[PDB]
Amino acid sequence: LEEMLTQAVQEADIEQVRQLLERGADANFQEEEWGWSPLHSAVQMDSEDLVALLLKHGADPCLRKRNGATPFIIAGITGNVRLLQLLLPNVEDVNECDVNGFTAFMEAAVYGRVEALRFLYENGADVNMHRKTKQDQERIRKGGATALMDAAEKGHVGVVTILLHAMKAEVDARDNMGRNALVYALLNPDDGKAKAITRLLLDHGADVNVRGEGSKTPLILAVERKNLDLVQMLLEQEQIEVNDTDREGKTALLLAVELRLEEIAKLLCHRGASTNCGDLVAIARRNYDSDLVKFLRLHNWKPQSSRWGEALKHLHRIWRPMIGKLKIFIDEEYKIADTAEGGIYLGLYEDQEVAVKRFSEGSTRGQQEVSCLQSSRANDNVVTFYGSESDGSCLHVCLALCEYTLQEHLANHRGDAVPNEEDESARNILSSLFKAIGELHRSGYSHQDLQPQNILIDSKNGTFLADFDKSIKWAEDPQKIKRDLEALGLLVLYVVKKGDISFETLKNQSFEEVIQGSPDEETRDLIHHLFHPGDNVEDRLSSLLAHPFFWSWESRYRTLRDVGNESDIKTRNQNSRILQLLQPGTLSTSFAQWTTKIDSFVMEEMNAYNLYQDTLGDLLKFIRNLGEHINEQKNKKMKSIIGEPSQYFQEKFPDLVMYVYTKLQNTEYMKHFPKT
Amino acid sequence: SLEEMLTQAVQEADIEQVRQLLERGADANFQEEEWGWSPLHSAVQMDSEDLVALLLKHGADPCLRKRNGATPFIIAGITGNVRLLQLLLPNVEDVNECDVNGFTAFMEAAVYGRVEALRFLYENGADVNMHRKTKQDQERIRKGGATALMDAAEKGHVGVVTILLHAMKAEVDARDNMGRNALVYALLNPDDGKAKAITRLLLDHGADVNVRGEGSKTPLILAVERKNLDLVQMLLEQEQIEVNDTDREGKTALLLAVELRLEEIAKLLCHRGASTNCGDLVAIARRNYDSDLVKFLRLHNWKPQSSRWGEALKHLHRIWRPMIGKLKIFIDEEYKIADTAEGGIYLGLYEDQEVAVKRFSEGSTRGQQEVSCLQSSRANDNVVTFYGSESDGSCLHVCLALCEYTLQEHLANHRGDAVPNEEDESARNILSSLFKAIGELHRSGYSHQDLQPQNILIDSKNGTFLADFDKSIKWAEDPQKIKRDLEALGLLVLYVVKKGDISFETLKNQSFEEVIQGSPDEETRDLIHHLFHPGEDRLSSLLAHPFFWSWESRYRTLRDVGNESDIKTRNQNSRILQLLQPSELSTSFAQWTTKIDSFVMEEMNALYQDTLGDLLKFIRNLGEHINEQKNKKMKSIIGEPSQYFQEKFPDLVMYVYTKLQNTEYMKHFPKT
């Protein structure tokens, strides 16, 4: 409670602070979050009195906080040299560094404290000392710069010359990345301070051929500064290398042209710049700078998409300005489709092909697009989100480049299956959707506008959800999930009908006529579960992935055969557990009277010794028996009337799979279901 | 080649080249099909008065449009030599013709500061106050609509800005389709003299200073962030400027003033009734060591998703830190996940999303190949999600999805889960994910080069993901080094099947034979052998190796093969059992009838030979009847049949697979 009262040292009311200690108070109590002590806080205030009042009570001036800084190293920042006088007699070393390396002397340089700089110099400060930081920091080649380098980057022109002339500072010292003070100097935005520090460093021997960020020579940071004075000052040096290139291969002259700098280019050419680092005239001409055009003539990428391959080769070929990491041109040739706002165009994000949805910089829907995308990057069935880039007035959200709408995809593949072949494709597309929407739901978003033009297919026939511009965080309103699940219902019928019924016809039908439009009992059941998912929605989608709809025909036949191989079915044991589940209590199904709807020959041949009864038990027994012997050669005749046996039984008995499914779902006999 | 000698000549400045060419019959309206440029266009962009004139004697259209829609007249507004504007004016239908983005010749003179053409187009009917009419896609994002004034203001053209407001009746508060006025454009020119002088000239004329620009920032707010007190003071001369207006992020002009270390600028917004508590201003001044501003006020939620790193990610979000582009990061042990070759990997915040961030020196060769590879991997669902990179100008920060556990940790946490001989579905799931990821990585053209359990990650939902592309390479350069990844996968197979009990590091010291011999079963031995001896899409096919078949599936396959007609009738010369016998060494199931319990054996003979067929037939028959009530005693000696046959004949599944691998009987294999 009484060490809460160090609040009093920042109210600057000295008269409480005396009482604090007498009442019982620790003057070295360090607040545990960042390490702040009273003396620490006192010296950042420049309060001559509080320094005196609590060194009177033993606050250590070599006490380190989280960052490693002592009140002495901080006193170099406030720059009042009387507080340096008050705690110097009690410091072990005037050249003590914090964990990033900053000394009292170096902090005087950063903050331009010119008379605090003076006291520490002839008091033993190491003028040329490079900074010692942490080991994680030194294998990234960080640290090592000097007070000179510090004064140069903070424009403290006064500090630089005092350091260079009164105190023998190494002008061409480098830090752990080879940066000299010259480099630090050329990143101050103020042009006057830059120019003066540069001459003050050049006249004394600073290496004018040094490298900094992005392998840029000083001369290159000068042209990219658009500051002709710096250029002429650096080219007054014999040993300047005018055709040095940066990381991306550009020379000082090339960029000078690119940025439409007439005089700056005119001067690099007039001083022996290499004119063949590129097509120089063509850049000036595209810049509508015909005065340079006149002066300068006097001296493999592979796209991945097939559909868009040829256009993305054209967009790679042409020149375009970059919007951050993105290369784009608004032209019909690169337009993929029309959106509410701005179309979606092809683009190049970090040299990768992408689709680009465009919003107004402040568009609420663009907000919601990026919010949802940013929460979905783990959702493997959501379009890959590369990132967004702003023009300052158009938000470019960049997405993976898919090949086809779901609707286009179905149209191109409508002829793929023979009219009654297993539709493996529908199962996969809808299953990805079921995953995509379920994971989207778990991440807290609901799509709100599911429809085939929002589902895209890639070069690998993966299906992906998209267009989150209308999504909503659903925690606020939890019943709103159920729209996605209804749309998913229509999407099941939409995809199973191979696209032959337009989505807009389905969105106008009632729930019942959509169920009625289903081609089989599996699909009818799945749609029904989507239209009535329960107020307890939770993760209903993940469970429906076990619906027989998703069982291959082989798996449904394997499961009928396995249920029919249970001991109590073959022995027709009516009071067994298995047959009490399947046929209890007395019938209006397709397999009532089933023995009277099998070909008369296969039937009686199959009575290879009473006979087969009209129980469902024996029909499973039947399917089991015929499954085991279909390919034996005494039955080659019978193999040909049945055709594929799975297809045979499902078509003569459309409700069979569903019926055995329903009766065994939460029983020990679920073990016979296929694996999911 | 007639008109491509003519288009060579119009830029050779060769006056007499172009004369013959044209008379000879060259088309003076020829448009190069890339961008639409005509000779007349190039002549006017060039400022060659002589060539423009000669190309009108031969009928060049001054209203001919190139790709953006610009005519040679509209281009003449840019070069700004009024002599060619006079030469093409009698032949333009309208002095106010726009290109497809809305630009008129008048607006172009404004943009390029060509003041003497600006006058020429004034007295010839130019619409000074025209807003730009642009494309449909551009206007549904509210782009376009800007004016000549807005153009001159944004390009510092002090000379052009004064003539539009005084001599030519320009609307000072005209607005664009985004509500930006000329004031907003003016305050974005980098030059301080040019900016400061243009700002005075539009405030005195009636520009509304309570407008919005980029990021909903008011003119006053762009002034603070300019750190230019002079600008601040002139907008501060209008009483109804609203000083407590808030931007996109809820910040006021006064809030930014302290944050940016602006003693003089802040002292002034307070003296103008700025709302002092939109955040703790004194805490920001003191954090900045600006004891001179602490002395002036002197006088007057987020949910982390990770569990393992959740509490630390709550602490990192809570504190203040500067941003590096989109990244919030603090270098401290408390936020350290692990240490790498260069710089450690720390927790971070990328666009307010939790992320792990690997750090390199700005120029590191290694940081390159990680970023090259990560950038190519976004379609790879089993490579860790790559958020983006940010450079501080001397450290490249690579930002990744935040997983919960290394594979070695994950196996350790689940080591006590399984009873000592249970089917290891976990091992199959982890390895297949690895198999997909390395195969998809290889298909994208990269090889990982340092596969090891510490580079494989497991997330909160027990999925596996690859990481550490810092030593990756584009493998076309050396297509053999692919086989380093495949060997590591071999070791990784044994490592995971041994549940983490044998260190990788022991595994790296064993010989190939010591890894094969150390394997618990024939599936694992065979799979590893193929990774050490492959034949560039080999990984995807091995996902169908019986190693990845469940025990039920393996027993299901032998039962099914054991049901082929020519096995049950022992048709000796049929194709199925011609495929089944070699040459080959001896197997554990030669003489197999003498390794079944005498009771089960005898019960089932009611002529089982040592053929492999009748063992498959045996498997098939017993599988069908095990559970009947006459066979309860026999059900009890065999137990679970799949485990029984695999333990009594450890080389059976591999053997049947190999003999049927690329035959029609491949159909009995489980579907993969």
Ligand SMILES: Nc1ncnc2c1ncn2[C@@H]1O[C@H](COP(=O)(O)O[C@@H]2[C@H](O)[C@@H](COP(=O)(O)O[C@@H]3[C@H](O)[C@@H](COP(=O)(O)O)O[C@H]3n3cnc4c(N)ncnc43)O[C@H]2n2cnc3c(N)ncnc32)[C@@H](O)[C@H]1O
């Ligand atoms: N009286 C108080 N009581 C209670 N709490 C307080 C009080 N006062 C402030 N607080 C709260 O503490 C929090 C911060 O604690 P701190 O200021 O003592 O420690 C800083 C930071 O945490 C910590 C590390 O920050 P970082 O991760 O960005 O690390 C910085 C950078 O990455 C690296 C660069 O070195 P180099 O590459 O140039 O060689 O070293 C750090 N650094 C850069 N310039 C520095 C400088 N002049 N002096 C010291 N360190 C510098 O060091 C302090 N710090 C950082 N930049 C600073 C700078 N320009 N000037 C002065 N100090 C700076 C504050 O945010 C605040 O909330």
Ligand SMILES: Nc1ncnc2c1ncn2[C@@H]1O[C@H](COP(=O)(O)O[C@@H]2[C@H](O)[C@@H](COP(=O)(O)O[C@@H]3[C@H](O)[C@@H](COP(=O)(O)O)O[C@H]3n3cnc4c(N)ncnc43)O[C@H]2n2cnc3c(N)ncnc32)[C@@H](O)[C@H]1O
């Ligand atoms: N004589 C030649 N013969 C053959 N080829 C040539 C020749 N000269 C140049 N080339 C090659 O043509 C290629 C680019 O074509 P282009 O310059 O003719 O057409 C540009 C672009 O295509 C096309 C669309 O480019 P963009 O999507 O980046 O769109 C720009 C902007 O986003 C959009 C709306 O702007 P705003 O009103 O919201 O501000 O209009 C463009 N625009 C900007 N400033 C413009 C200006 N002053 N005047 C007219 N349009 C301007 O418009 C041309 N363009 C762009 N910036 C321009 C600018 N500052 N000044 C003049 N024209 C500009 C060049 O690459 C070059 O290789």
Ligand SMILES: C[S@](=O)c1sc(Cl)c2c1C(=O)CCC2
């Ligand atoms: C990645 S983008 O989402 C995309 S690619 C592609 Cl083809 C289309 C779309 C759409 O939205 C709808 C129009 C067709």
Ligand SMILES: C[S@](=O)c1sc(Cl)c2c1C(=O)CCC2
């Ligand atoms: C994306 S990073 O690669 C990462 S996340 C994470 Cl937990 C760990 C790692 C490691 O390297 C090893 C330590 C654990």
